């Protein structure tokens, strides 16, 4: 089914932006949905958010995490899908959350490899490709 995968981080920089052939919305509106709220408490911790972009019939789910204990900078793995996937997305969430964990581990290992705090924006980066592949082969198929 169609999807848009954005990997981004705070310094905001977009590392990957991939829409499926099958599949939008402005990048500045997304930065706000991803890193933008007075309804949720900000804990400075690793988390998951699901938001409905009413203006586009889309649901956005985001894993956001820190490089490490000492860091104040966030990395986000965000995905847009049709809002009618929300029932399946919520039914299958323990599966999706576990796959997002692997994606989070993968990007963190890149940072460890390169002793850096920054993902490339011109990614032969196998770690970024591995995340795209996890969405293509595991997450999105489960959401049909």
Author numbering: 9 to 19, 28 to 39, 44 to 56, 58 to 144, 148 to 168
Manuscript excerpt for this entry:
In order to overcome this, the Lst4 longin domain from Kluyveromyces lactis, a closely related budding yeast, was expressed, purified and crystallized. The K. lactis longin domain (aa 58–226) crystallized in the P42212 space group with four molecules in the asymmetric unit (AU). The final structure was determined at 2.14 Å resolution by molecular replacement of a higher resolution native dataset. Several loops were missing in the electron density, between β1–β2, β2–α1 and α1–β3, in addition to nine residues at the N-terminus and 13 residues at the C-terminus, most likely owing to their inherent flexibility. The structure reveals the classical architecture of a longin domain, which is the first domain of the complete DENN module. The domain is made up of a core five-strand β-sheet, with one short α-helix (α1) traversing the face of the concave side and the longer α2 and α3 packed against the convex side. An entirely novel feature, which is not present in any other previously determined longin domain structure, is the kinked helical extension to α2. ConSurf analysis of the structure identified two conserved surface regions of the Lst4 longin domain, which were mapped onto a surface representation of the Lst4 longin structure. The first patch (P1) mainly comprises residues from α1 and several that lie on the loop that precedes β3. The four molecules seen in the crystal structure do not represent a biologically relevant assembly, as an analytical ultracentrifugation experiment indicated that the protein was monomeric in solution.
Flcn is also known to have two paralogous binding partners, the Flcn interacting partners Fnip1 and Fnip2, which interact independently with Flcn. This Flcn/Fnip (either Flcn/Fnip1 or Flcn/Fnip2) complex has been recently reported to be involved in amino acid sensing through regulation of the Rag GTPases at the lysosomal membrane and therefore controlling signalling through mTORC1. With the motivation to understand more about the Flcn/Fnip complex, we sought to investigate their putative yeast orthologues Lst7 and Lst4. We solved the structure of the Lst4 longin domain, thereby confirming it as a bona fide member of the DENN family. Additionally, we show that Lst4 interacts with Lst7, not through its longin domain but through its DENN domain, and we demonstrate that the Lst7/Lst4 complex exists as a 1 : 1 heterodimer.
